[PDB]
Amino acid sequence: QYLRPGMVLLKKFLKHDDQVDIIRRCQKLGIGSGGFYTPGYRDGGKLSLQMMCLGKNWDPSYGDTRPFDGAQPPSIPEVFSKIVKDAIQASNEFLRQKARNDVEELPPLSPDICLVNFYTSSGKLGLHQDKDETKPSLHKGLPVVSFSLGDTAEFLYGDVNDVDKASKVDLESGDVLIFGGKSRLIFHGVSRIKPKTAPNWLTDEAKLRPGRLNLTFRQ
């Protein structure tokens, strides 16, 4: 649960039907206009990764359409935003209960982007900061809220671009991870996808392919 100031991991936060619904909506959004593509560049490097944005588009920074094909991203489903807000509320309640030092509290989020990352089993994403948001967003420490579904990721995090100084946590299917405030500019990334770790009920009900779906909400 508490990983460092303003960084909370909510285990198995996503409900059954919400996990299925997320996958089904992403499968459909993923094949249409503004769907998944293989990025030519990601800060930190990458392997076996495809992405698509909902809300604002995030290109190699932010815009209304993808330059390479002109497609407008699908908007962020209202259910996704609701679950983001619930995660932030639950984290703030936890932080209030944990207070001994200042009381910690994460800023609210009204996300206008969702980056959807899909990793196959050989997937990885190198260490980087989420630093492309506007200066006021960053200065306010508005959090990043990350959903995990499917196979488990080994997620690295730390203060610098060196794995030797990074911590590791597993992000398992259903987990929501939040980093804001003093943790907003952590270096972070995905070192490994653990094969064959997605819950069977999810693979079966959502017809989920091998790998991991991440949704990362910001601004």
Ligand X SMILES: O=C(O)CCC(=O)C(=O)O
Contact residues toward Mn ion (CB under 5 A) are 130
How far, in Å, CA of 65 to CA of 83, rounded?
25
> Pick from 73, 81, 184, 75: which is nearest to 135 by CA?
184
Q: Would the annotation count 200 as a binding residue? A: no
151 is an annotated ligand-binding site residue: no
| Residue burial 85-105, b: 16+ Cβ < 10 Å; e: rest | eebbeebbeebeeeeeeeebe
Which of Mn ion, ligand X, none does 115 bind, CB closer than 5 to 8 A by kind?
A: ligand X
> Which residues have C-beta within 8 Å of that of residue 75, sequence separation ≥ 6?
54, 55
* 119 labeled binding residue: yes
Shortest distance, position 75 Cβ to ligand X, whole Å? 19
Q: Which one of 56, 184, 188, 192 is in contact with ligand X (CB under 6 A)?
A: 188
Strand, coil or helix: what is 173?
coil
What are the tokens at 39? 């990025």
131 — phi, psi (to 5°)?
-120, 15
Q: Which of residues 18 and 132 has its CB atom nearest to ligand X in the complex?
A: 132
**Quick check: 176 binds ligand X (CB under 6 A)?**
no
Question: Which of 20, 130 has the CB closer to Mn ion?
Answer: 130
Decide: is 91 part of the binding site for ligand X (CB under 6 A): no
How near is the Cβ of 56 to ligand X at its closest, in Å?
Answer: 14
Q: Which of 149, 118, 117, 111 is nearest to 15 (CA)?
A: 149
Give the sign of the dihedral formed by CA 174, CA 165, CA 190, CA 45: positive
- CA neighbours closer than 13 Å in the CB half-sphere of residue 215: 28
Among 91, 92, 117, 219, binds ligand X (CB under 6 A): 117
For residue 83, the partner it binds in ligand X, Mn ion, none, with Cβ less than 5 to 8 A by kind, is none
CB 202 within 8 A of CB 141: no
Q: Answer yes or no whether residue 115 interacts with ligand X by CB under 6 A.
A: yes
Residue among 190, 193, 198, 206 that touches ligand X (CB under 6 A): 190
Query: Residues forming the annotated binding site for 2-oxoglutarate?
Result: 42, 117, 119, 212, 218
Query: Residues forming the annotated binding site for succinate?
Result: 42, 119, 212
Interacting residues toward ligand X by CB under 6 A:
115, 117, 125, 130, 146, 153, 155, 188, 190, 214, 216
Query: Residues forming the annotated binding site?
Result: 42, 117, 119, 128, 130, 188, 212, 218
